[PDB]
Amino acid sequence: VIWMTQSPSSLSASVGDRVTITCQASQDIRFYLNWYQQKPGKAPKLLISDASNMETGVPSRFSGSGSGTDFTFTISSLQPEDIATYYCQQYDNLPFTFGPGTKVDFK
Amino acid sequence: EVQLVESGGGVVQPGGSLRLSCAASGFTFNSYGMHWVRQAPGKGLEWVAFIRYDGGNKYYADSVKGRFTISRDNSKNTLYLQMKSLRAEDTAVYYCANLKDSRYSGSYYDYWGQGTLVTVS
Amino acid sequence: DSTECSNLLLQYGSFCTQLNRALTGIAVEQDKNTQEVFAQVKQIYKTPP
Amino acid sequence: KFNGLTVLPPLLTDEMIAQYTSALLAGTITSGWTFGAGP
Amino acid sequence: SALGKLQDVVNQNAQALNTLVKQLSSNFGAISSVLNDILSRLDPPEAEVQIDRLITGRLQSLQTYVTQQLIRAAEIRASANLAATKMSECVLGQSKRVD
Amino acid sequence: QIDRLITGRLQSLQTYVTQQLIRAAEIRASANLAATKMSECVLGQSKRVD
Amino acid sequence: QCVNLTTRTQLPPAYTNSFTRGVYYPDKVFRSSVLHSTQDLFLPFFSNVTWFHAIHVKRFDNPVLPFNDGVYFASTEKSNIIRGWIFGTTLDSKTQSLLIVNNATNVVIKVCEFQFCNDPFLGVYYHSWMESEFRVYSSANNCTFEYVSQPFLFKNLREFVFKNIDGYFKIYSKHTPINLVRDLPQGFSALEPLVDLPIGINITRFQTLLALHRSSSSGWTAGAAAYYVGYLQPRTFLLKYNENGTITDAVDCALDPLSETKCTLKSFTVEKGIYQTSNFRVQPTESIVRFPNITNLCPFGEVFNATRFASVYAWNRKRISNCVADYSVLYNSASFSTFKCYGVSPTKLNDLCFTNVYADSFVIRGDEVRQIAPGQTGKIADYNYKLPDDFTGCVIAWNSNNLDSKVGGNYNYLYRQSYGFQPTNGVGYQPYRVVVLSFELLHAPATVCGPKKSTNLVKNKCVNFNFNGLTGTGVLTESNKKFLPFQQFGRDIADTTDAVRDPQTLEILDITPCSFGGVSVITPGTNTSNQVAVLYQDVNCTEVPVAIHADQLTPTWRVYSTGSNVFQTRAGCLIGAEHVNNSYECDIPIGAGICASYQQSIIA
Amino acid sequence: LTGTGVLTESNKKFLPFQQFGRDIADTTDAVRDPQTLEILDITPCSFGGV
Ligand SMILES: *[C@@H]1O[C@H](CO)[C@@H](O[C@@H]2O[C@H](CO)[C@@H](O[C@@H]3O[C@H](CO)[C@@H](O)[C@H](O)[C@@H]3O)[C@H](O)[C@H]2NC(C)=O)[C@H](O)[C@H]1NC(C)=O
Ligand SMILES: *[C@@H]1O[C@H](CO)[C@@H](O[C@@H]2O[C@H](CO)[C@@H](O)[C@H](O)[C@H]2NC(C)=O)[C@H](O)[C@H]1NC(C)=O
Ligand SMILES: *[C@@H]1O[C@H](CO)[C@@H](O)[C@H](O)[C@H]1NC(C)=O
Ligand SMILES: *[C@@H]1O[C@H](CO)[C@@H](O)[C@H](O)[C@H]1NC(C)=O
Ligand SMILES: *[C@@H]1O[C@H](CO)[C@@H](O)[C@H](O)[C@H]1NC(C)=O
Ligand SMILES: *[C@@H]1O[C@H](CO)[C@@H](O)[C@H](O)[C@H]1NC(C)=O
Ligand SMILES: *[C@@H]1O[C@H](CO)[C@@H](O)[C@H](O)[C@H]1NC(C)=O
Ligand SMILES: *[C@@H]1O[C@H](CO)[C@@H](O)[C@H](O)[C@H]1NC(C)=O
Ligand SMILES: *[C@@H]1O[C@H](CO)[C@@H](O)[C@H](O)[C@H]1NC(C)=O
Ligand SMILES: *[C@@H]1O[C@H](CO)[C@@H](O)[C@H](O)[C@H]1NC(C)=O
């Protein structure tokens, strides 16, 4: 089993601020990491697949990168609509696992 | 166009059982593998199980292994999760999903249902 | 109901098929034996009142 | 049964066999050996 | 003892089945006659060896059962053939064959 | 590894021969009946029913 | 340069009946005038193949599809819009991907780290004609494989099968004429092997490549294009080879009871009669574990909550025996500052048994706690309390500053000298209470065991069970057997258990095997009819649908799980035959006076 | 593809992709020569009792 962690567990930022979320794997998941965005009352939405591949419809302000055990998710200019809990998921091998999740709040 | 609808939730007693189902439409259900994911109140996402497109190979999380069974009927486009000997810790919102996965399911698209609440007490 | 044993059993060939066939042949024969002894009339004859 | 052992039923029941026997008896009593070689 | 001839057939076949089942309790050199004990105690590379010992013994026991059933079946067939002949010659006619 | 093949193949051959002996006995009985019928049905007139 | 063609949303799927298509030569072996049974990945008969319209009439929707265990692909076009395919996983510069492109004169197959466009296509220009692969990918590096040959590609129907086994990418193909539209043709045609590529890459996803004409994304136009995609499954087929080594027919052995019979008999023609083709087994639905209640828990609290603890130079010992050691009580306690175990994990302790358990206890300083372990040295480790290198047990400790400290110094506690513990001392100087649980496992009867977890009791269902160590599989029902007060389970004349006493309720339960038996198919003969009836031997009709696993079968096989025509006989449950009150000469024997015949439908 | 036997010219018609053939017992009885693409029949080397 591959354990996933995230840091910080929670961050606050204002509009236009740069927001970064770190996700780590206990093992090498290669580039196999999905980034999800979940808002209250809704199912998680996928923003990035395979470490850095953006999903269609996802704003250009969203990006990410990384390889092996250390991955980063970035918002280059936080909007009022980007307030959500972000999750990382590894899918190198089964069982699949999600990280604790990082909550982004409003400053 | 694509929809996933969970049902069969409700309230059961500890040591009891409950079977969930998910109706799929708008896509070729029988071409994709499917996942179950649960989220307890105040908690994050926990992966539960995965079944391959042909309904053959089955995989489960360690937290549910030996208690949960995953199945699908490709003639009715319905995914099932049979949970038995449910404990209080199993209280969560259960989702059916098609999770984008370049290694196993081969899915190029990511879809989620609405989620059905299962309470054990 | 052991899968591990079943997979090993397959490596011995068709012994099980032969055994199943032998017992099936006997079972069929048992009905032939009864038919030959008792079913020697084409009509069911009744005695007078 | 626990070990994959089963028993199959006969095609003819005991009642059917008894019926065959009675037909043979009725034949012999009323028609002698003629019924065994024709009408 | 008037019907010993029919009872003997029943007894012999019952005995054969009882023996076949009882053989499943034999080890045949394996650590246990119970297949589950082998799988629970030993890793696959060793469990397979113990299982083969049970397979050989159980397959041999089953083959022995079938062989004797074929031999007994032949005896019953011969008896049925005689019964059928008697039906035709003793019941459906009058025999001149002595005894 | 060879002994494993010898045991299996020897067992298979023994099984074949055993059933041939059993089948041979059946054919022998049938041939004995055919020979009796030749004598009693063809080389004479039988009074034995059926 | 990549452009955006997929500006429209995805259209809803359409489906077509496969009938009998997608069958290929499983190997390169000549076989003639013979029926050969093979297990391989085939397209199931009469399956639903997805019908895609990549170009609808200018709507462009040409999705990435899963590869699964192999793909059946077919198309009917004269415009030569479909040129090739992309196979791979990530489908970007991070991994190796397979690019197959056909053109006017040849076919080019490359495996490289391609960086593909979001919706890749082949660019076609007219000046002579020019073709460009730069509309498929922006770049490619680290190429590992290259192969070039002749082109792979009424109207013409083109069928392909793509497999990827043990690093080998296998392609099969067939080209036939067709005069039908909006469907796949009926009839049989086997696909011959085209190429076997020793590539050694993983494929999980693929995409069809279309050619577009330059006559930015708005400048690309092509006529309507459509194709069919199916998926292969692990199936057994009976293949009919003719006198020339060509496959002329086939049977999908899992399509229906009749096909199953054909595969069993190894024939495409079946005579009137009843045949056993398979078996059914009822599977367990729950696992039931039952033990007696807990009667006595181990007195560990008597040590941990002691009013006073011994000095380290003169530590105390308690002996624990004849009890249930619920170690999880101490492990999950918030009253401890540390809990470490040697030779054993603290989370497995509840499942272990020991011949003796001993609890050692004393008072030390915080900076001395680290000395209570295997492989340690120091004033305590060497002179007061020594643990062996192979020690098995757990060391637990907690702060006792509110108890063992006194104003002016508590000199009642000593070591090999007094401590003088004070409430104002620093963390490493404050008193700590230590308890060590040593686990002795000798060649002797156990005296201490953890608690046994019991589940609820389930009756009248096929379950797995464990009654106080007595295990098996079967159906548990209430028994009318009268056990003596000391008897726990019973056996029959064959020395097999057939009854158990429930360890909690003391109720006697009967044990029966989970239903099993043969499955026989009753047929009038394929020269008369393709109707069949299915007999489930030694089973109750109520249980049939769960014994054959109806949900795992084809719709054709699921008709015979149940229905209007269900007749219970002494031979078993007969489904598909209509019982009548008439009587006829026996045609196809079932048993116990019952026969079946075809009169049109099958009757009993 | 290895074995022992007698190689003779065959009148069997293999498809362009088929390299060798088998009988109903799943034993090879014909092979395509990899250089000439000629089809050859395979027979056992003569044996029997004396
Ligand atoms: C194509 O897919 C297969 C299946 O997923 C890939 O095989 C997997 O390869 C990884 C290593 O890259 C294996 O992980 C290793 O397992 C050993 C044993 O536990 C461990 O000691 C190593 O540290 C590492 O975790 C993985 O088990 C293996 N999966 C299977 C089923 O064998 C294959 O690598 C993929 N090919 C390419 C080019 O990616
Ligand atoms: C169809 O594909 C073939 C194979 O790639 C192309 O032929 C190549 O053309 C280049 C450029 O002249 C040569 O350097 C290669 O040596 C040729 N390969 C072979 C095997 O001859 C062909 O040009 C393509 N057709 C079109 C219209 O582009
Ligand atoms: C194909 O789909 C139809 C519904 O459109 C369904 O009734 C039929 O059973 C399916 N066939 C198979 C083999 O799944
Ligand atoms: C090219 O691909 C092979 C196989 O994946 C890999 O081992 C090699 O390191 C790659 N070369 C470069 C420069 O990436
Ligand atoms: C088999 O081949 C012969 C020529 O050798 C041909 O005449 C015959 O029609 C072929 N049979 C079939 C079914 O194609
Ligand atoms: C277990 O406890 C239950 C509930 O008090 C009681 O009914 C049952 O008889 C007890 N069984 C044993 C073995 O103590
Ligand atoms: C088999 O079918 C033929 C017609 O093709 C028919 O003439 C014949 O009587 C049938 N045989 C039986 C037993 O029905
Ligand atoms: C089948 O089960 C029912 C109860 O569901 C029972 O009444 C019936 O007698 C059983 N039939 C046989 C042959 O045992
Ligand atoms: C047969 O007779 C029984 C009454 O004994 C009746 O209930 C049943 O419906 C009849 N079935 C048919 C086919 O006539
Ligand atoms: C091998 O070379 C010979 C001589 O040119 C030729 O006749 C034969 O067909 C060739 N075979 C193959 C497989 O290339």
Residue numbers in the entry:
A (entry chain L): 1 to 107
B (entry chain H): 1 to 121
C (entry chain C): 745 to 793
D (entry chain C): 854 to 892
E (entry chain C): 943 to 1041
F (entry chain A): 992 to 1041
G (entry chain A): 14 to 70, 77 to 146, 151 to 176, 186 to 247, 254 to 454, 493 to 675, 690 to 694
H (entry chain B): 546 to 595
What does the paper say about this structure?
Coronavirus entry is mediated by the trimeric spike glycoprotein (S), which can remain intact or undergo cleavage at the S1/S2 cleavage site, yielding S1 and S2 subunits. The S1 subunit engages specific receptors, leading to conformational changes that trigger membrane fusion mediated by the S2 subunit. Activation of the S2 fusion machinery leads to exposure and proteolysis of the S2’ cleavage site situated immediately upstream of the fusion peptide (FP) and large-scale conformational changes from the prefusion conformation to the post-fusion conformation. Except for mouse hepatitis virus (MHV), most coronaviruses use their C-terminal domain (CTD, or domain B) of the S1 subunit as receptor binding domains (RBD), adopting either “down” or “up” conformations, the latter state enabling receptor engagement.
Unexpectedly, S2L20-CVR, which recognizes an NTD epitope (site iv), promoted robust entry, challenging the previous hypothesis that NTD-recognizing antibodies are insufficient to induce SARS-CoV-2 membrane fusion and entry without ACE2. We confirmed that S2L20-CVR acts as a functional receptor for SARS-CoV-2, supporting membrane fusion, pseudovirus entry, and authentic virus infection. Therefore, we hypothesized that S2L20-CVR induces RBD opening thereby promoting viral entry, similar to ACE2. To gain further insights into how this might occur, we determined a CryoEM structure of the S2L20 Fab bound to SARS-CoV-2 Wuhan-Hu-1 S ectodomain with stabilizing HexaPro mutations. Our structure features one S2L20 Fab bound to each of the three spike NTDs and three open RBDs instead of the previously described mixture of up and down RBD states for the apo spike. However, we previously found that S2L20 can bind to the spike ectodomain when all the RBDs are locked closed due to the presence of the S2M11 Fab that recognizes a quaternary epitope spanning two neighboring RBDs. Relative to closed S2L20-bound spike structures, the open S2L20-bound spike structure exhibits a repositioning of the NTDs and bound S2L20 along with stabilization of a conformation of the N234 glycan that would be sterically incompatible with subsequent RBD closing. Overall, these data support a molecular ratchet mechanism for S2L20-mediated RBD-opening, whereby (i) S2L20 can bind NTDs adjacent to closed RBDs, and when an RBD opens, the NTD and S2L20 shift to a position that blocks subsequent RBD closing or (ii) S2L20 could bind to NTDs adjacent to already open RBDs, thereby preventing them from adopting the closed state. Consistent with this hypothesis, incubation of purified spike ectodomain (without stabilizing proline substitutions) with S2L20 triggered spike fusogenic conformational changes yielding postfusion trimers.
